């Protein structure tokens, strides 16, 4: 429903409406349930309900804490984007939170002894900073013209009226 | 009428007071203004985080790694772009404070003409027949209340321009001549209240054989002892 | 009787600005990414020159409550109001001085719109209609409160009272001033069905927005010092590294012609709300009452004015 | 906007694309989240999935509006869309209406009436 936000940068903010345009999992896409072969479009949000398996066919290790990459190192959700970040954060329900940074540093991934697979899009949000620095609330702009006249005015409350938001345009179909 | 038009300015009083202690929003138009000047304030400071073409939008990190041959170059662009904003910025205060003062002109001119005098054009100090008004302060703002005569339950009658009694045209000094179907009287004209018709509040002007309309009636002579 | 003609509104327009600077390139609409919030700035500015252009004439012509109709037996003692009343015939509104009024005004895609008015014509001829029917079956007394009856010739006599002059001057000479306002009305028809053009003052407006649009056309074919004015053709021939000096100057010169058109329509609109509001206290002190003010309705003693519609316009015919 | 085809030698013709303009029609967010889209002057032929096919299509003469119920009655405008035509939010949705100018009055005047008032109201 709502997964898959996080910081995006390592700058403190508060209390403001930033808007990044950023590669995020779309709000209310589809997801696989696992309980085996999994691609790699351009990065993938993982949950859970040991560790992972990367590559394409250098291999990419995590086991339980060591790391074989060469690099070595000594209800759970996962954010790996590949500039390869993890982001990680634990406590789907109908629920939403920010994701913290963990660590810094393929066609195909695969995982060891269920879970999810989700799929990031190229996208923009609208962040809401708090007090306390942490993340309340996003808004995904092209889901819906409700939340395109949000990302508009940048506000998360409209008023009553009438607001130009965008342009339209069909495409070219094909060259010639 | 002076008890019964005292309890309609009190009943009137109180519900602009509770109109205005209900969560009503009426002060739209001293909210815009200051929603507008905030807003261009709020522009005008983020355009600062634009690089306008340059490496940066700091001048710090442009200055402590630049050299002043190929720095400069850098800094003309951010010059420009920050004298355009201001530019902008300026004009449209300009443009905006013109209509600011056409308001206080006519502010002026309402507390002029509806405060120090009753005036008699018409819907410029409220809507019906103004009798006076009262100034009350706002912020950034003046406002005012106006009070006014508004007639109500009117009745159907029989109307004629004159009366001839022996002869001659008779016209009235101020006011109609009005009928309830048997008898005939003369009235004023917002307000009715027949009177009998004398030769003290007509006047009499020609023969009745030229005005379209003329109705024979009686025309009382006050003196009738003597 | 006089013809006094004011303008009220003028054509909203639109400016799709990412398109106009330089449509279908994603590498140029990066490149106007550079320069913060412009194109807000100028649509901001547009929209509240387009909600003001329909709020002018609201003020303007939405001033009773009711639609009065004038009833089938017109019988005004003499006077003749059938060239301004309106006509069954035609398939609006619309009466035969109005359609002389509309006739005469003539003149009449790069992200350049033009958006539609709320109030239509037949929406205002409604207006014009109700404020003409309340005026003569009312006197004065409908911009007051509750609309009154009384009879035509009992209303004029006492608007004379209300110029120094008694009353049994109407009731002993009303057959000639009955023949001399027609003959008015019929020389203001006339002079109007002729070939003399008097509605300079509507068409200046006309041809003053017409000008600043071609100007802003023609603006895009200016090259501002690049090797051309067409931007496929730099993209075409240049790396886009060789390409950026050239677009950088096209964006420079386009966002320089759509500030200058932009200020040039805010000082225009500003001088358009003084118009109509000048237009809007001669409605109110004019149609709904009788002025002592000297010559600002008409020209000698005034008796009564009528409004009639105009393209963003409006025009009064006093008394 | 016409060009000789350098091969048939043929006189063929350039126009432009759709190109219109989107308006998101919409209450307070403490109402409803329902809205309505405006495609400015595309003629509803020529147009997301849902806010493009489907029921509640209407035409204006300021364009096409989707996912508002046109009806016949006349009231007070809420929301201005253009030519004539308003919008309001009415077991709830979002209407479209031919906006009202006021009440009908037909003032009973004759030759020799007249109306006196007898009271009257401070305001
Ligand atoms: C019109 O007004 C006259 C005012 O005089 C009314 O005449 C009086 O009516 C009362 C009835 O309450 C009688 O007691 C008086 O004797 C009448 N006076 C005269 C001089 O006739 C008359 O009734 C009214 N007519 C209508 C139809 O209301
Ligand atoms: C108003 O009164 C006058 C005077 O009584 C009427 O004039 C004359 O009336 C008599 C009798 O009705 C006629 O024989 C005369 O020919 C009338 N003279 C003129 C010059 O008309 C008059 O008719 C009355 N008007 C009404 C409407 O009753
Ligand atoms: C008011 O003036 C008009 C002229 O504008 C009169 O209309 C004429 O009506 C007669 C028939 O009654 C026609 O034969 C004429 O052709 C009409 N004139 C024109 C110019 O078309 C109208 O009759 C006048 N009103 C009254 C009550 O006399
Ligand atoms: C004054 O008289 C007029 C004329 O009778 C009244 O208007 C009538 O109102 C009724 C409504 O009950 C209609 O059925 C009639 O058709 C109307 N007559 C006309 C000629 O239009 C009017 O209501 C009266 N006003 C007052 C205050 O008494
Ligand atoms: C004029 O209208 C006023 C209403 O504003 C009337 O005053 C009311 O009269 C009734 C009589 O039954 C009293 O019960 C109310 O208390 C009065 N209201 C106030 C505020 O005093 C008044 O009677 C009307 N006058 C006429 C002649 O009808
Ligand atoms: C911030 O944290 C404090 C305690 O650490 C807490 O009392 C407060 O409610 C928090 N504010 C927000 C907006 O989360
Ligand atoms: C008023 O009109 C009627 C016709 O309805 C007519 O008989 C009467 O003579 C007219 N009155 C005047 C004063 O012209
Ligand atoms: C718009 O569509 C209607 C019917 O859908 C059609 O009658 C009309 O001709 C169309 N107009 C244009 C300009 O295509
Ligand atoms: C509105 O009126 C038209 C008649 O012009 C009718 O065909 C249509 O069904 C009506 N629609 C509704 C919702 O009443």
């Not at chain 1, 990419?60 to 790996?80: A, D, P, S, W």
């Not at chain 2, 709020?42 to 442009?62: E, M, R």
């Not at chain 3, 330089?22 to 609409?29: A, L, P, Q, Y």
């Not at chain 3, 009312?138 to 009353?167: D, K």
């Amino acid at each position: 429903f709502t997964r898959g936000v996080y910081y995006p940068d390592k700058v403190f903010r508060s209390s403001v409406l930033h808007s990044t345009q950023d590669l995020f999992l779309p709000f209310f896409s589809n997801v696989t349930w696992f309980h085996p072969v999994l691609p790699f479009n351009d990065g993938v949000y993982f949950a859970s309900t040991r560790g992972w398996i990367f590559g394409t066919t250098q291999s990419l290790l995590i086991v339980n804490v060591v790391i074989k990459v060469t690099f070595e190192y000594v209800l759970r959700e996962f954010v790996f984007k590949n500039y390869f970040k993890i982001y990680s954060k634990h406590t789907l329900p109908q629920g939403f939170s920010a994701l913290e940074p963990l660590v810094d540093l393929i066609t195909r991934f695969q995982t060891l002894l269920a879970y999810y697979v989700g799929y990031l899009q190229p996208r923009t949000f609208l962040l809401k900073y708090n007090e306390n620095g942490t993340i309340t609330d996003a808004v995904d702009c092209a889901l819906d013209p409700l939340s395109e006249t949000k990302c508009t005015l940048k506000s998360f409350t409209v008023e009553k009226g009438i607001y130009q938001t965008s342009n339209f345009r069909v495409q070219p179909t094909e060259s010639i | 009428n002076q008890k019964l038009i005292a309890n309609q300015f009190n009943s009137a009083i109180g519900k602009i007071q509770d109109s205005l202690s209900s969560t009503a929003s009426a002060l739209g138009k001293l909210q815009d203004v200051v929603n507008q000047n905030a807003q261009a304030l709020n522009t005008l400071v983020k355009q600062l985080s634009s690089n306008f073409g340059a490496i940066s939008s700091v001048l710090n990190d442009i200055l402590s790694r630049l050299d002043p041959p190929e720095a400069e170059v850098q800094i003309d662009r951010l010059i420009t772009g920050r004298l355009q904003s201001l530019q902008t910025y300026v004009t449209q205060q300009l443009i905006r404070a013109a209509e600011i003062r056409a308001s206080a002109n006519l502010a002026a001119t309402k507390m002029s003409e509806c405060v120090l005098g009753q005036s008699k054009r018409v819907d410029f100090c409220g809507k019906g027949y103004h009798l006076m008004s009262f100034p009350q302060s706002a912020p950034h703002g003046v406002v005012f209340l106006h009070v006014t005569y508004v007639p109500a339950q009117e009745k159907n009658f029989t109307t004629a321009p004159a009366i001839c009694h022996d002869g001659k045209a008779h016209f009235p000094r101020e006011g109609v001549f009005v009928s309830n179907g048997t008898h005939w009287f003369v009235t004023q004209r917002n307000f009715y209240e027949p009177q009998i018709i004398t030769t003290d509040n007509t006047f009499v002007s020609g023969n009745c054989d030229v005005v379209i309309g003329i109705v024979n009636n009686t025309v009382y002579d006050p003196l009738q002892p003597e | 009787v006089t013809t006094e003609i004011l303008p009220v509104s003028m054509t909203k327009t639109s400016v799709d600005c990412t398109m106009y600077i330089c449509g279908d390139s994603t590498e140029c609409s990066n490149l106007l990414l550079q320069y913060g919030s412009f194109c807000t700035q100028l649509n901001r500015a547009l929209t509240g020159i387009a909600v003001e252009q329909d709020k002018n004439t609201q003020e303007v012509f939405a001033q009773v409550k009711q639609i009065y109709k004038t009833p089938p037996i017109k019988d005004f003692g003499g006077f003749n109001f059938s060239q301004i009343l309106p006509d069954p015939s035609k398939p609006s509104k619309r009466s035969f001085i109005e359609d002389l009024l509309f006739n005469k005004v003539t003149l009449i895609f790069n992200g350049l719109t033009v958006l539609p008015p709320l109030l239509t014509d037949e929406m205002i001829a409604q207006y014009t209609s109700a404020l003409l029917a309340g005026t003569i079956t009312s006197g004065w007394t409908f911009g007051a409160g509750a609309a009154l009856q009384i009879p035509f010739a009992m209303q004029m006599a006492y608007r004379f009272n209300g110029i120094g002059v008694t009353q049994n001057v109407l009731y002993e000479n009303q057959k000639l001033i009955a023949n001399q306002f027609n003959s008015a009305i019929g020389k203001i028809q006339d002079s109007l069905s002729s070939t003399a053009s008097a509605l300079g003052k509507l068409q200046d407006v006309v041809n003053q927005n017409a000008q600043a649009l071609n100007t802003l056309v023609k603006q895009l074919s200016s090259n501002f010092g690049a090797i051309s004015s067409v931007l496929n053709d730099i993209l075409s021939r240049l790396d886009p590294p060789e390409a950026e000096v050239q677009i950088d100057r096209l964006i420079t010169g386009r966002l320089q012609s759509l500030q200058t058109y932009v200020t040039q329509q805010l000082i225009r609109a500003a001088e358009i709300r003084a118009s109509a509001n000048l237009a809007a206290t001669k409605m109110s002190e004019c149609v709904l009452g009788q002025s002592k003010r000297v010559d600002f309705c008409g020209k000698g003693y005034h008796l009564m004015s009528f409004p009639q519609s105009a393209p963003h316009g409006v025009v009064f015919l006093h008394v | 906007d016409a060009v000789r085809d350098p091969q048939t030698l043929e006189i063929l013709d350039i126009t432009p694309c759709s190109f219109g303009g989107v308006s998101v029609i919409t209450p307070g967010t403490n109402t409803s989240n329902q809205v309505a889209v405006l495609y400015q002057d595309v003629n509803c032929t020529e147009v997301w999935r849902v806010y493009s096919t489907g029921s509640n299509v209407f035409q204006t003469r300021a364009g096409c509006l989707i996912g508002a119920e046109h009806v016949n009655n006349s009231y007070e405008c809420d929301i201005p869309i253009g030519a004539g035509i308003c919008a309001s939010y009415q077991s709830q949705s979002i209407i479209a209406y031919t906006m009202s100018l006021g009440a009908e009055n037909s003032v009973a005047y004759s030759n020799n009436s007249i109306a006196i008032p007898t009271n009257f109201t401070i305001s």
